[PDB]
Structures are given as C-alpha cells and as structure tokens.
Symmetry: C2
Subunit: 207 residues, 2 copies
C-alpha cells in the first residue's frame, strides 16, 4: 500500500478475511483518524464501509483519502445504531475503539456487529484488560469503567477480565484469541498496556 497501519493485528484479520469464502465486504466500526485501517482492505480489493462519530477523526480520514486517491466510504454515525441491514456484511471489526464506552454501550455495539454480520461472517474486536497500567486510574464511574484525562481530553475507558470478555463471544466460534501485555517506549517513557483481541465467526442456525 505504501504506509503501514498502526495496528498490526488488523493484518492478521485481513488475512483471515481473504481466506474466508465470503465476498470481500468489510465494516470498520470506529473508522476515522489520520491512518484509517480500511486503507489495507481497499488496497486488497474490498468494498469498504466505515462508521465514525467524531467530526475531527472523520475529517482526518477524508484528508488521508484524498491524499491517497481512495474512497473508504466512511460515514458519520454511532456504532450503537448501525445503519446497515441484518446480515449485510461479510466482515466487521472494531479495533482500538469499543472500550471507549461504558459496558452497557459496549454490549449495544457488539450486538449491532452480530446483527449486521452474515452467517459465517468474521468479527474482530479488542478490549482493554485489567492488566493495563491505567486500570483503576482516573475517575471511577462504574464497575470497570473510568473517566480519564488522556492527551488533554476526557475519555471513558472500560476494562475487562478475560472471563468477562469471553462472554461476548460465547454464542460465536472464537477462531483466535490473544491476551497481551505490551511494554513500549511512548514519548521518552515506558508504558504497560493490556489488551485482549478476538477473531470470531458467526454460527449458522437451522431447524
């Protein structure tokens, strides 16, 4: 493509989607920013759709689009209420996104992902875990939910245990689950991050 996206797990997801027998249609729930990962899907022949709630992030993704001569098909919207029909998407991901919401909203959004996914369709979703350095920091607003100042702005972070995250996929076939603890030097200093990533397939139902 030219540039490498920031979240390398989405290259694993792209490889799974390429291997799936379903046709190449993908939705990014939370798609904006200056390096939108839908780029690697468009570059690999996908029909893409994106949803983004932030005006600024949507503007950044559009600038990137123009600069690179892409149409990514990102629209303003709320991932808790997807404007797509039931069983319309082969593949859906919400990566680095879902945990910016309260747990009731996380459930709404995941339910929407499940709804729009075709039978046999793949979802990729990741979560902050209780192994993250910022678990229990900032202002507690709910169980496993904190309002934190990050880069000058208030952000909600929700955190899960692995037992808790598994419950979101108990009705799906988990193909890939990775629990990770990352220690990386960000802006001069070491930070510890905790994520669990899932790639799961929607069951087909009969009789």
């Amino acid at each position: 493509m030219k540039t490498i996206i920031r979240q390398p797990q989405l290259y694993r997801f792209l490889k799974y989607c390429n291997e799936s027998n379903l046709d190449k249609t993908v939705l990014d729930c939370g798609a904006g920013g200056d390096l939108p990962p839908l780029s690697i899907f468009v570059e690999d022949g996908y029909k893409t759709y994106g949803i983004e709630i932030s005006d600024l992030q949507l503007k950044k993704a559009e600038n990137f689009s123009r600069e690179n001569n892409f149409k990514l098909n990102i629209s303003k919207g709320d991932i808790r209420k997807l404007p797509f029909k039931d069983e319309s998407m082969s593949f859906v991901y919400s990566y680095g996104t879902i945990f910016h919401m309260r747990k009731n909203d996380v459930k709404e959004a995941i339910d929407e992902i499940k709804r729009v996914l075709k039978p046999g369709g793949l979802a990729c979703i990741n979560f902050l875990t209780t192994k993250d350095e910022r678990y229990n920091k900032g202002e507690k607003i709910g169980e496993g939910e904190f309002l934190q100042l990050e880069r000058g702005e208030k952000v909600i972070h929700s955190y899960v245990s692995l037992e808790e995250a598994d419950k979101y996929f108990k009705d799906m076939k988990v193909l890939f689950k990775e629990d990770r603890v990352v220690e990386r030097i960000n802006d001069g200093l070491k930070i510890k991050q905790g994520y669990v990533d899932y790639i799961a397939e929607k069951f087909s139902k009969s009789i």
Copy 2:
C-alpha cells in the same frame, strides 16, 4: 499480494521505516512458502536472508519468482552469519530462535548483535513457559524439550525474566508478552510467546 503470517513483522517494518538508518534488513531463518522479507522488498529495502533448509530455500525462491522479486536469501547457519561486523541496519529472527537448544540460541543472538549497526534494531521472539507444550515431550535441558512437531524436534522455552537477559545491554523499545488461543487440528491450543524490538547502543570509552 498475499498477506504474511506474522503480523508483528509489520510493526517491526514500521519501526525500521521510522529509523534514520538506511533500509537494509537481514532475516535469520528466512525460507518457506511465504517469506516475510517480501514486505521489506516491497517497501524499498535491500534484503538479506539466511536459511539452513534446502527445502525451505526452494519454497521461498519459487514464491519470489512467482511474485517477481529477489529476496537475496542464501543457505547458511544463523549461528555463523557470513556478514561483517555492523553491516546491517535491521535484523530479525521471528518464529525461529526457539527451535534450538539454548546454547545455540545464545550463539545466534550474539551473531545478530555482532552484525547489527549501532542504533540498529533487532526483532526476536521466543516461546514462553505459558505455552501449552512447555514441559511436554522429552526434557533435554532446563527449558529444552524434544517434541514431535511429525518427528523429534527441539523446542526451547523461556520465562520473561530469562528472555530479558538477552537484551540487558540493549534498549528495549517494544516487549509484548502474548498468550494465544487458536484452533489447530480441530482442537483449541494455547501458545505463549514474547516478542522484542530492541535498539543497539552506541558505545564509547571514557
């Protein structure tokens, strides 16, 4: 463009792209049907690879000619790199090192460090004690096992404390402890890896 199997190497590539050093990369253990040197070649790098297996070398050369590039992979032993001191900006050994006894691991890592330029980056990963296969098969050394990945093959496993000691004289930019559960042969399996990206210090003498 087939996507490579090891997504962490896309992260490594981005680190290498951000470095000020020129774009030369060595893959220690480079063969197979989907050589990750492909992503570096595609991004403008001068590439070098070392591969011990004739079969693995053949698979990578067929891939290369099928995809219309030259990866510059040659037969060799990663414990004895045919390159000069401080010749390479970037070096990786990914999915490779832990197929050896720990004495051999040390030799290979020492070689990576040797050929790496000051300021250069290394990416290396390891099997950890969280892997399901830790303590299975025939124990031949502390954290060394003869297992059946097939036929009798060597796997070495590390604790994180143990893995850290390999980079104690380097600047670790990125360290990721991973526990992966996925499907193999119709069953859920659990794998444990730790991945490092580290930078070589410039050294001076007072």
